[PDB]
Symmetry: D3
Subunit: 158 residues, 6 copies
């Protein structure tokens, strides 16, 4: 009965995120992707972000996607789990991630496992992908095909 | 007669800060905790922050608490000192602290000494403590008792 | 059927290592502690290192201890697994750990999950503990009680 | 026909930036300083002021020119027939963010990024920290070119 | 006429090194790869290392390969240049590279430009490649073809 | 009666070390430079040579003295009735290892460690890199005190 939670805002989900989802799903019996509700409203609504993740994780039967707000550790514990799996990329503020991990262990006994994303997906972030795409750069190799079309949709209607 | 200034916003003071204050007070004849007034906007007023620090440092007779505005090195030099003691924790932007230390030495001849807080208090920050408490997380092991009491009152 | 391998030389095992073992054992169905055979001979023989780990992990029923040499990924794969759990402490060469993790994923498809050890055990390493103990410093709070007595035994016979 | 672009907001240019400009000009046939403007956020100096301050402090570098732009840096670079960026490193540089941007810029446009550490003397100055210190009266005159220092004090007063 | 030196032991040259050589050769009129002779002890001789690099850089007409001993900045200045191009990868000790760059500028006026290797080649190093291959791991995607062939021969 | 210990192997002392000594002496009533010796590995200079080179370059600091030792630094500190260490930071410092040692030293002996960044001008010198550069003829004379430079060249020849 093992399980982990993969948290983020995923605005939008990238192949970097998907890589981490896949590895978590391969090593734990159950995975929950936790989508942050946090009113800065990004580019996509929470429902849009959930849909894009669900579309991209259809081949992962033991993964589900749910939104949450408030403490991540509450999200995790209320589902009977006590592990978080967090991806590392180029540009990750790792010191802040370590601070949060130690706090989350202290207040709720939740462990955090870090995994580095694949080199190919190591320089994409949701923010940098949006920025580049806004100015006409090609990020199609860095996002799930579906996500990519939706992004083009939000820009070419702004 | 030696001396150092321990600067910060302390909104609120944490056990991480207190550990650093204690070590400064043990190693310098005089310590001044400098509480930043930033009119560009916290949870506690400057007077409340000063009072919380005084409560937590009651056993440190050579330490005093004062508010300050503007350039830290002016605050330091105006009190006849030229040393700053700054704590390090998990999540400290140390490269930025180093930049500021080298700047502060250049513009005023003020030295900065860094000390790592104890491992037990190394992941608390004023910001993260407030964030956790807001959502009902228990940070009472990470703050002085009087601070935790006031924090609950501000949220309730 | 989940599982992970916790690698190291463990010369000797510390409470930092034990903390990581406990977390791995709490989140995976099966854990193997892999003790490196690598002729620099340390302070303890491989058998001594294994014994000290077994003594300290008696309350972890799903953990076992085995020695290995050669590629870690071969050790992992030959046991039907493809995950490593590695602890982080103060003084960990994380950049080198990241390099090895990406190489190990490339050559064998093995994932590496990193977890930070508890703040209390974050400044102990096998090397620093031996060094301090050699010169008469008290490291009793940083090592399993058994390990501590064995260490005193190897120094007070040198 | 070698060449590189040295990008930044230069609000204002510092001696740390000039050090990097000088090194780039010594090592590439032509250097273009790219003054990158966010049309949605004003800084302290206007684009013409920024360019004037850079020109005045680079008059001894005959193979360097200064131009403004916005949008993608790699478009600015490729439109001038170049494909190299030279970026300085200082104390407080977010190097991981720079690396992320360098890898992204290579991926989307094939443009290379070369990093060079600025001289130790100029390694703790940044435009933002210089402005902050000067705002409260601190002496930053040794860290900025003459073309900048009193213009800065003028803005603040 | 611009130019730079790309230094290393290259024991053996990797695709990480080659990526950096290619970028240097694209941006400078002349590039010299400087192969370190260290009489304090590798797997390949200097002649073998030079030959492996030449095979891998056959398409780069403005790049040449030479061995060198002693101070890198002397090697650079003796060839009428004053720039070094050094690659960064995962596991690079960048603080030490920065120290050496500042030293090299101080003692000889030589600039050092750093470039990150491509993500695909970012975790290979000569040392880790040899270590993995010794135990039968497949690093053929990380080395030039001719290099991988020789490596197998040295181990067998 | 404040005081601190400044530890190192000082083989040889550099201007980066002297900068730190000077700052410690300006901020503590007494400073002891601790020349820590490994009885199992000789360096370039003998302990008496190391101490002589430090004394000659610190003659203007009346509240500083120099002593050698071995074993645990915290024992050296506590035997002099002190409980503070002042350690310099430079480019290339393994800061994580220093932090590990500082936390261990607090744990086992209650001794505090204060870190200070050395001046930018002296931030890239280390004893080992100075020796390596000088070995192959590079000019390190601006990075070492006069008490050191020609003694170093003497050892190498
Ligand atoms: C409840 C919840 C869900 C997702 C989250 O994702 C994050 O990246 C950070 C959070 O604090 C978080 C919290
Ligand atoms: C005048 C004053 C007082 C306290 C401070 O505290 C800080 O953390 C940063 C400052 O610049 C500062 C300045
Ligand atoms: C086969 C084996 C076992 C344990 C190990 O432990 C390590 O820390 C590093 C290794 O490469 C390793 C390899
Ligand atoms: C003369 C020479 C040639 C190649 C080198 O390569 C290096 O990686 C470091 C050196 O100091 C060096 C020196």
């Amino acid at each position: 009965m093992t399980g982990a939670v993969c948290p983020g805002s995923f605005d939008p989900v990238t192949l970097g995120h998907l890589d981490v989802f896949e590895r978590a799903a391969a090593q734990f019996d159950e995975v929950i992707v936790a989508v942050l509700i946090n009113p800065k409203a990004g580019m996509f609504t929470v429902d849009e972000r959930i849909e894009m993740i669900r579309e991209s994780t259809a081949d992962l039967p033991n993964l589900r996607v749910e939104s949450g707000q408030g403490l991540l550790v509450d999200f995790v514990r209320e589902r009977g789990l006590n592990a978080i799996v967090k991806g590392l990329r180029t540009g990750t503020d790792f010191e802040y991630e370590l601070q949060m991990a130690q706090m989350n262990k202290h207040i709720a006994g939740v462990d955090t496992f870090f995994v580095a994303t694949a080199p190919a997906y190591s320089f994409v972030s949701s923010s940098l992908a949006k920025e580049v795409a806004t100015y006409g750069g090609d990020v199609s190799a860095l996002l799930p095909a579906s996500v990519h079309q939706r992004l083009l949709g939000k820009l070419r209607g702004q």
